[model samples]
Target chain A: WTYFGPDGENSWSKKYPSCGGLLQSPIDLHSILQYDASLTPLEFQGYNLSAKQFLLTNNGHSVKLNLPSDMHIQGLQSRYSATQLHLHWGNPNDPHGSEHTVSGQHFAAELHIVHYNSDLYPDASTASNKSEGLAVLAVLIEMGSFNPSYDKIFSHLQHVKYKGQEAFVPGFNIEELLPERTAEYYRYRGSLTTPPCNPTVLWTVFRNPVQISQEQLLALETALYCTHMDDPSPREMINNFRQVQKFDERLVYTSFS
Target chain B: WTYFGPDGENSWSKKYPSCGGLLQSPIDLHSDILQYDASLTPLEFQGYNLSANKQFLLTNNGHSVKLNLPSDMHIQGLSRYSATQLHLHWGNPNDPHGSEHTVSGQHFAAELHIVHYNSDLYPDASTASNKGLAVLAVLIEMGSFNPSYDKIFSHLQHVKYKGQEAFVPGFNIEELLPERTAEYYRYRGSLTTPPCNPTVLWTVFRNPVQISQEQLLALETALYCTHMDDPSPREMINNFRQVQKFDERLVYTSFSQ
Candidate 1:
């Protein structure tokens, strides 16, 4: 399945422009999130994650893994610790019109990595017990030509192609994907994008975006579901993209001009 | 005693402009303070206690009051109640510089009044007793010619003449003045005048200023205490002033264009 935009459309441009009530990720990768001179790059870190790509391994139904150790948020009480990182798509290509939209415009892909407050869930072996169990840093991915900054992430896609695959690859700092400034941001309370959509994640979406090429997006599109759902083609599988959840009166901070 | 412009005295002019710092007040009046939406006229309360002719009172003494509010702020938390309502003193004749001075040198006769929150006391009045306060509204008084506005306040000035008056008649709601627009600008701040202040108040300076006259300026000059050590009878008493204070990381908000 090519998975163009939402609803199995073949083209992203046409389908995204009119996704009905569905919200699309408005693609503009050059925006910055929060930026304050007082905070430096070294301050942001996930788990064992380094300067390149944070680990993202398959977990049967979806991907789950730890985040890099460099993303420091302000109001995130020290109770939460990061756990896994994953990507959600819409159709194969456009991914439900958007990953995140600003003033209403959609991007090509949406990436989410989950974290739980370590203090809340003391035992990492079974960390879900704490109330402050998760913190997700969502970085919207847009389709452009192959950019040098994102080469580290796209390069690792080949190894984790199959379902149930897991690995601890080196070199892929999530920080490199973000713009130089992270001073301002929009904050809001929202649920997880995946199933069970627990409205617990403290979503810190970078006002900035990192880009990938059409060819790079195609790599994720080709990685169809390991399990066949409605289609019997054994090979014909549903992509990992999920639907956009509802937005309440949650606050969203913007750190761009 | 007639008030004289600083133009004649280099020391006064140099020091006078410094009085017009970032956090000048009597400009940031809250909407709730003024009742019935009635614009107050000087005639309502005799006139400000100043001498010369009946006029509005303006000062930059860093005078402030405390108030409690019902609203919650975004990050700073609810503890500090608001304090201090600065005043605006302008030259009576030329461009009467209102509390707010423009790049163009204009001055209004005088703008006086107080600022406080809608509530009663600071938020952490019991717990974090030291954390400062929030929410302040300002009342801007333009020296008015109305005899009514001057009625009570002027007579009381006699008692406080040497800054040793026995409790001057408290302000009347009817005589209080304000800007044409309820719109205001607010910012987190410290007292911007005397004692070289810090974090003692929420400074609110209004954008739209009121008007006054040369006679009103003379009134403020007349209020000066004859007891000053400098026995220059020829020098008109200029009691409307104060030195500016420091300001670094503060946020300001406004309601008018």
Candidate 2:
């Protein structure tokens, strides 16, 4: 089931019934969104602290970085614990690589940090089905001067280029990668952007974008291989971004002007 | 000098001051501000017929591959504008994402720009660059091989490096444009490249032209940013400027869709 061939996104709903559901993620954030000054700023705990070694893997879809259980987020109705983080990028040549676009403009790439509600649900499996079970913090990525925080992970991409391959990465401050003003964000109620698109996510997409050097962008564009080691023809894992879903009657709220 | 690295778009304003001006080109055509204007008439073209004796020069300028048009070629609708040149913007083969101007958050594989100067107001392109200009932009997608573009892509080998030029036979210019000429988004913007002037009328077609994967690869991989005298060669991929802000402007469209 590749992204280009017959078994791509169009056929996802045939296999995963939830994929064609009404509430989906990866919506286009427009400029005419409603402003809600009452929304509080996002609060994080243990994001700046150094944790034990973590695994980074290429799961035939994207390069994913697993998270430690200690890190969590507050300010929402319930505390959500960090589960994992992954990236969606186009080729280094394409500027529109991000899964989400702001008013029809795309960023070079996107970072999705997934968290599950821990106040009520025990595990991610149980929490992924409920309306308020999951929360995702989305950061848009663009190309510019070098970003040291991303280099912490991109520097190790060569170690986990192939499908199912894994690498151990040293501890780093997760908060350093997120935008400085967590208060200014677009909030919406949506589902997972990928398969089994459950309507369980509380989306918070930052307005500001993080920058990376062209060399680093090329490294990310070329390093990962989507095909398995046994495959005869190896394919590069570029353009891992999903198409923007339907907006429908969903009201996108922003914390800032 | 380049789309990436230290001397990339971020530093363009230092070299060309107009690059950081208020009104810029390649703005994302969001749906929020779009309004149907029945006043826009169908675009009219002159001297678009294919002629065996008519030849055009295709040149590689280290930044992009541009095709020089005959002075007689012009378009008339909003105003009498004479043709200047036509250039292309493309993404890499792996990513298959380009198109300088996106529509409703959707991007195509590449874009074709037909640059023109308002003969009714300006004496030439140089003067029109800052006063009056009009550009017809067509988005390109990867699908079937378009025989219409064969006249250009087939001769890419001749102008493979910077400063290289080759003679290309003329083809039906109208065939190169999208089918629905009546439907489009119109706005006032500036040049997408360096010396970004804020004096151009932009018209982007809603439909896209189709090209095969092989043809797209030829555009993405065949061109080189390095000159014939350079010590090291560099592939000219992602030859596109990023999208700029709208700055409280309205985009008028011909059709409701």
Candidate 3:
């Protein structure tokens, strides 16, 4: 379903019931979050990658990079192995495309590094519907200085311009894609931003936003199309983020005081 | 202007910027995000007992039926808020529930909002900003007949069309409130309508008031959006705005559950 037409996010719940369910993702994260000392700094394991080819695909929705299974995170209830990483962004005219907001203020973009509970599930797809199955690390992006780490994925956007298109991206330190202060973050339980949106993701959205060049931001916004390249109606993949969900009775716990 | 047409809540942001802003009104009041506070004492209703000899204007403003309240009537607490107006929002005869705020996702039969301004600080309601304006909201359900509400419901026929005004004999407005006024939910929110100002302090009572099903039907069928003579007249049904997101905002309750 398209983000802006007859069948948008508002109508998704009719088919995929969980889109309107509780503990949904991309809620407005506020500064007045309760201090959660128990939420210690998360450990990034096997984030560094060799200069190997990483599969970059435009899946008719977002430009996603397939990560190795070895890459995982620590300090959670269970160890979650990395599955893939993708970005959600906005157009040049309306730069606020991030799925989540800080006190109703939107950053220019957002990045999601998704992982699955390797201890229980066989793969990301199997783990998606189960409880405590996924762990997602989100980095809010703002426009500023040139970010060399982000350019690794941004540089491959041109090759994957249409739906089902793919490109091989040179691997680098995946940890570099995260914010500087990963320890300082907001921890909550939410669902995936897309359809069949199972509320199984353990989300950790970093407090500090990483910076990206204006040119890089524009490239990501204008590079990919949700519709196939051969389609008569070429829909650009911009504002590919869900509106903030109703965060009733949920408390966003902060790692820092 | 209407609830479901092209000029609905979805398109409100185009004309009113604040409609897209945070700390908006009519959020669902439930246990999940509630914090019990001892400071939330019972509010003092001053000058709510009006003289029966006096008369007030009850107007149909093409949106909701609003009764012009005297500025002298105010709520006394940390700050005094002078009464400006009172209005009712409800669904059509078939639907019956049209309250703005929801309780655990359940919409009551109707809602009553008594708008007041901080009389101690501002010269008038228009001058007040944050914490300067206060609203007393009471949820309405169908059970028994409410004689106090009949004071207003009986006059709905008089001002059935938009811009129509009728003189209502002043009565004890405090009697209109539900029993156990001490327990309520408090938060900082915005005006539910256009220009959606995020300035008002909200006080929604815990206990709901009752209005007979017949009275509810009277409220739902008595109003029209058109003037006394119009080609395309519309029934003013489901006039209440949808429940907004509780984005990082905590709702405090006077009663601890």
Candidate 4:
């Protein structure tokens, strides 16, 4: 589905019915928050992937990296092993494209690292549709300094510039891509921002944003396309963020009060 | 001279000599340090509207986009402070949370500051800047399109470069503020900008205001911090100071929690 035109997000529910259902993602983080002290700083385990070649692909919607299931987190109800990671962003003219907003404030872009509840499910694909099955860590991106760690993935964008294109990237410390003060974040239960809209994902959106240089932002904004290289309608893969859904009755819990 | 690079907030103390500290201003408004003030009354806003045919000057002062407010527009009660001018602070196309103040450590999309002087005790803002200045702050977030804010945002492109300016027809100034102004946070704080002064009454409204994402994007990218003839042009983004400490002073809240 396209981000704009006849097949845009507004029209998604017509094809994927759950997009209009409850607990939809990318909600504004505010209102009647019940602060829970039990929400401790999440512990990242095995995030440092060391030097290893990994497959990166442009899947028409976003540039995604395949992650080894060995990487996992240690502070939730169940251990969620990493499955993959992808990004959503805006174009050169409009840069506030992050999926989830902090009190209605959008960062430049967003990075989502997908995982599955290994203790309760077999794989990400299976867990994606089950209860208490998936957990996703989101890092907000802003423009400031050069982030060479992100370049570990960005460096391969040109190789996967068209839909379905693939490339190999040598893995680095995946933890470095996250912002400092990992202890503070907003936690909520929501659906995947994209289609199939399963409402089983546990989302953790970091409070502090990570900075990337303006040059790096431009490179990412300009590199890829939603259409295949051979297609006449070559649409740049920009403004991939979904519009924020309603708050309804959900309350966000923060790690820090 | 800028929010980034050598001239950023870190270097402002070298030239201004006093920004390093504050009873200062823009502290985080959270419950942990808040106390209800029963004596706080609803502030009286006087002469907040202007004739639709009257014109106001909007200018890019290299640091922020400011709209000059007339002295006749003053707040009654609490010593009668006369309106001087109003300006905004925001993040760029990529970093949308650039407000000077954060609530519960959460940054809004942007912030609006309306400056006033004690007309009862001083002749003008320049003379009363240190002795009797007061500022009212309203946090801005992205939501519905605000037609009142559009009165100024619509003219952003006209004053794209530093020193450039445009004229806008005056409208009801009170329309820019959110309802429930009576419930707010009050404290004695300093100016948030360079050549910082430490004696001012700061009132940050409890409820935030909303401007659409499109309006915010225009506000984020439509102006520059550099002049029209400069060799390298600088966009006027991330134009906000970091939060300062309240230092033993209790931030008084109007509402009971």
Writing each residue's lDDT as its tens digit, candidate 2 over A154-246 gives: 999998889999998888899988976888999998888877778899999998998999888888888999988888999888777766654
Report the lDDT tens digits of candidate 2 across residue range B1-257.
Answer: 77655455535665666665566677778656578999988888898775768788899988888888876888987768999888889877765677888776666899999999988887789888877888999999889999888778998888889999998888888888987888889998888888888888999987899999999988888989989879998888877776654545678999986
- Candidate numbers, best DockQ first, in rank order: 2, 3, 4, 1
Residue B143, model 4: Cα distance from true site in angstroms? 0.2
Per-residue lDDT tens digits of candidate 1, residues A42-95?
235543244354465654455454553344333456644445566654344233
Winner by TM-score: 3
Q: Compose the digit string of candidate 1's lDDT tens values, residues B1-257.
A: 11222222112212334222333322222222212312311111122222333232332121211111113211122322332332233332322333431111122344443333323444432322234433333323464454533542344344323322322233332233444323334444433333212233443334433333534554444443333343643322332332111112223333322
In candidate 4, stretches whose alpha carbon ends up further than 4 angstroms from where it belongs are A1-257
Give all candidates' CA lDDT scores: 0.39, 0.81, 0.85, 0.83
lDDT of 4 by residue, A88-142 (tens): 8877765667888776566789999999999998899999989998999999999
Where model 1 places Cα greater than 4 Å from the true spot, the runs are: A1-42, A46-56, A64-75, A92-97, A123-130, A228-232, A235-239, A248-250, A253-257, B1-257
User: Which residue runs of candidate 2 sit more than 4 Å off their true CA positions?
Assistant: A1-257
CA lDDT of A141 in candidate 4? 99
- Sort by TM-score, best first: 3, 2, 4, 1
Q: Which lDDT value does model 2 have at A7?
A: 50
Q: Identify the candidate with maximal lDDT.
A: 3
* TM-score, model 2 to reference: 0.55
CAPRI-style class, candidate 1: incorrect
Q: State which candidate has the highest DockQ.
A: 2
lDDT of 4 at A206: 89
